[PDB]
Amino acid sequence: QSLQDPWLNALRRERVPVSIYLVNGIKLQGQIESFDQFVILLKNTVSQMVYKHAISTVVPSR
Amino acid sequence: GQSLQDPWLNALRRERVPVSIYLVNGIKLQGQIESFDQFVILLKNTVSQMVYKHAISTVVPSRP
Amino acid sequence: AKGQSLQDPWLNALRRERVPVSIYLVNGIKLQGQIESFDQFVILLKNTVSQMVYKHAISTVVPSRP
Amino acid sequence: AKGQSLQDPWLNALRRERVPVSIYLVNGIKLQGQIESFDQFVILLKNTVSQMVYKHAISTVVPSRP
Amino acid sequence: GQSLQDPWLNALRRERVPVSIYLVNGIKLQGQIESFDQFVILLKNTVSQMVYKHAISTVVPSRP
Amino acid sequence: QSLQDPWLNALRRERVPVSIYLVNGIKLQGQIESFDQFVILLKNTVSQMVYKHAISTVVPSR
To answer: Which residues of chain D lie closer than 8 angstroms to A33, CB-CB?
Structure first.
């Protein structure tokens, strides 16, 4: 909410590359294209919709 | 009511884009989005199956 | 679509029509039977016995017939 | 600059950031909404509905915020 | 690749010359050329707006 | 192409005054300073760049 939205918003605006670790161990990398309450759209060579319930952590590269 | 998910899935449905749905358990389903609501997605391939969103990790369209 | 507008009519059709289904759980177990009843959170699945399945444990429901 | 090096990143930034824009048409009509998507020739503009606007009909795009 | 337009606009941009952009519909915009590409000009005044070249009739710099 | 370029080139070289009528009805007058594929630079009391897509006709004075 008061932390999650502004944090992702600044990453999207600044085009900061991120790593998204899923609860199952898979690591995704890309730019945050957009997001809403339940999903984050991540763009690398492809554009994919990631459900937040499957994410463990989002780690910015810088 | 803010949604990115709703119009993104609706576009995929309307334009009948093939997608891959990766489940949290690592299983990959493929097909077209026939319909969806708040909690489920109806995926159509050789058969029509209902997938619970809570079981989904990622949806990858074969074109955006 | 919005809300339960897909899940409820889809499960209700299977229930009324007694279509055999396979219910795949997130852990990979496959359950089979007919949908006897359901509510917001559970599905009652009838095979040799009637068992209550929590929807949160389900990944996919695959009907044996369209 | 050359090619689409200005138009594409500028529209993409507005799209990703869901910045409300005004789109002034060559005939003087003002359209408003958020850029949902765009390609070479059209912009999909979302307000109460999603409408496809041909770029050839547009004179200026004015963002509501920088 | 022959261009008069590219270096002329680039000079105006680099030297931050105020220009008037007259549109084909008779509307006059004013500001400085912030940037441009093949099809658009970004004009800066109180706000920064993208103008499509196809809508422009003439660009008049307040000095050449 | 084979007509437009040599015609404008001779007007520029000979310093022939021209009238440029725009599709919207406005008449501009001056000397052709230069031109390329998409624009003509017209000089009178000011130097202005005119997009060819906005021009209907170019009429030489002599």
So the answer is: 16
Place of tokens 């009528």: F21
d(Cα D20, Cα D31) in Å, to the nearest integer?
11
CA C55 – CA C47 distance, rounded (Å): 17
**Chains F and B lie in contact, requiring 3 or more CB pairs less than 8 Å apart:** no
A/B interface, count of CB pairs below 8 Å: 50
Pick among 3.30.930.10, 2.30.30.100, 1.10.530.10, 2.50.20.20: CATH of F1-62: 2.30.30.100
CB within 8 Å: B49 and C66 = no
Of the CA atoms within 13 Å of residue E3, those in its CB half-sphere come to 12
* Solving technique: X-ray
d(CA A1, CA A7): 10
Q: How far apart are CA B59 and CA B17, in angstroms?
A: 12
Amino acid A20 reads I
C-alpha–C-alpha distance, residues F12 and F4, integer Å: 12
User: Contacts for B41-47 with beta carbons within 8 Å, 24 or more apart?
Assistant: B41/B9, B42/C6, B42/C10, B47/C62, B47/C63, B47/C66
CA D5 to CA E38: how far, in whole Å? 8
Element (H, E) at A8: helix A4-13
Instruction: Look up tokens 């429901």; give the residue.
Output: C61
Residues B38, B39, B44, B46: what is their CA dihedral angle, to the nearest 10 degrees? -170
Return the structure tokens found at A27.
């690591």
Fold for the domain defined by B1-64: SH3 type barrels. (2.30.30)
CB atoms within 10 A of CB E51: 24
Contact F48 E60 (CB under 8 A): yes
Resolution in A: 1.9
CA distance E40 to D17: 21
